Amino acid sequence: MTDDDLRAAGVDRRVPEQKLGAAIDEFASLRLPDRIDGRFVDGRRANLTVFDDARVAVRGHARAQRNLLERLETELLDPILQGLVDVIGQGKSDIDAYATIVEGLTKYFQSVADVMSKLQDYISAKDDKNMKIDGGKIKALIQQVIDHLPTMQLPKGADIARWRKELGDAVSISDSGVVTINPDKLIKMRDSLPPDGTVWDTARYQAWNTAFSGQKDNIQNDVQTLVEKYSHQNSNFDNLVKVLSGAISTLT
């Protein structure tokens, strides 16, 4: 089976991967209000639909993979036969797992992008060179994002141990197979805000902006890493499909 054979079969990994990249790019472009030469410079909000598109592509791709895997299996139904079946089962578990994990991480990514944009309504210029920040109102919004974080359930019978090493630090896994998003960075961000009505001079605000934006950047690295892992799974799937597709031709 060739790369184009895969595509004709409806499986094109470039699609979801490009979309996830576009969402990461949308995230990176987000920028808090600042002052350049005493001139208050508005920030950049985010297009939230970019994240919705990523999520639909991830779900779409998963369905396409399951379709192929299933038709490949049905037409392959001995040692070789048993081994291939045990591999097909593993392949399916990984398809459902990553799709689930990636969709949840995307919702999380989308929500942070939301506070990043909304929060800008509470940051304005006061004096000729002073910044007014309503930390309380922003703090409340970050707390909301924390409260409603998405939760992802792994497929039945999944090596919780292996997935823990796989997913990394940004995430955690329950013995019940529930993968959660670490609120570590959102907490640091929330704990950095000042009370409402706070007015900071340029230097002071820039200090906070640097730290805050630093955490935002950390969230982006987490997602980016996970995305790279997801895309590596898509590659592993294409290989599985190619091998068992050859086995089918060999056994015929």
Resolution value, angstrom units? 2.7
In whole angstroms, give the CA distance from residue 53 to residue 217. Answer: 22
SS (H, E, C) the chain: CCHHHHHHCCCCCHHHHHHHHHHHHHHHHCECCEEECCEEECCECCCCHHHHHHHHHHHHHHHHHHHHHHHHHHCCCCHHHHHHHHHHHHHHHHHHHHHHHHHHHHHHHHHHHHHHHHHHHHEEECCCCEEEECHHHHHHHHHHHHHCCCEEECCCCCCHHHHHHHHCCCEEECCCCEEEECCHHHHHHHCCCCCCCEEEEHHHHHHHHHHHHHHHHHHHHHHHHHHHHHHHHHHHHHHHHHHHHHHHHHCC
* Listed residue (199, 245, 227, 205) closest to 72, CA to CA: 245
Q: Dig out the tokens for 173 from the structure.
A: 């896994």
- 128 burial level (CB within 10 Å; 0-12, 13-18, 19+): exposed
> Rounded to 5 degrees, what angle do the CA atoms 32, 144, 44 make?
20
In whole angstroms, give the CA distance from residue 98 to residue 112. Answer: 21
Q: Dihedral angle at the C-alpha atoms of 156, 19, 65, 153, nearest 10 degrees?
A: 10
CA distance to 40, 50, 138, 203, 215, per residue, from 132 (Å):
11, 30, 12, 13, 21
* 131-155 burial: b if 16+ Cβ within 10 Å, else e: bbbbbeebbebbeebeeeeeebbbe
CB-CB contact of 16 with 57 (8 Å)? yes
In whole angstroms, give the CA distance from residue 118 to residue 234. Answer: 34
* Listed residue (105, 100, 108) closest to 148, CA to CA: 108
Contacts of residue 24, Cβ cutoff 8 Å, sequence gap at least 6 = 109, 220, 223, 224, 227
Task: Using the structure block, give the residue that is written with the tokens 């409603």.
Answer: 148
- Type of residue at 179: V
Spell out the long-range contacts of 173-177 with Cβ–Cβ below 8 A and sequence spacing 24 or more.
177/153
CA distance to 122, 199, 207, 208, per residue, from 42 (Å):
12, 17, 18, 17
Pairing state of beta strands 39-41 and 34-36?
A: antiparallel
- Type of residue at 91: G
Instruction: List domains and CATH numbers for the chain.
Output: 1-252 (1.20.1710.10)
Q: Dig out the tokens for 238 from the structure.
A: 């294409």
CB-CB contact of 186 with 145 (8 Å)? yes
In whole angstroms, give the CA distance from residue 113 to residue 216. Answer: 9
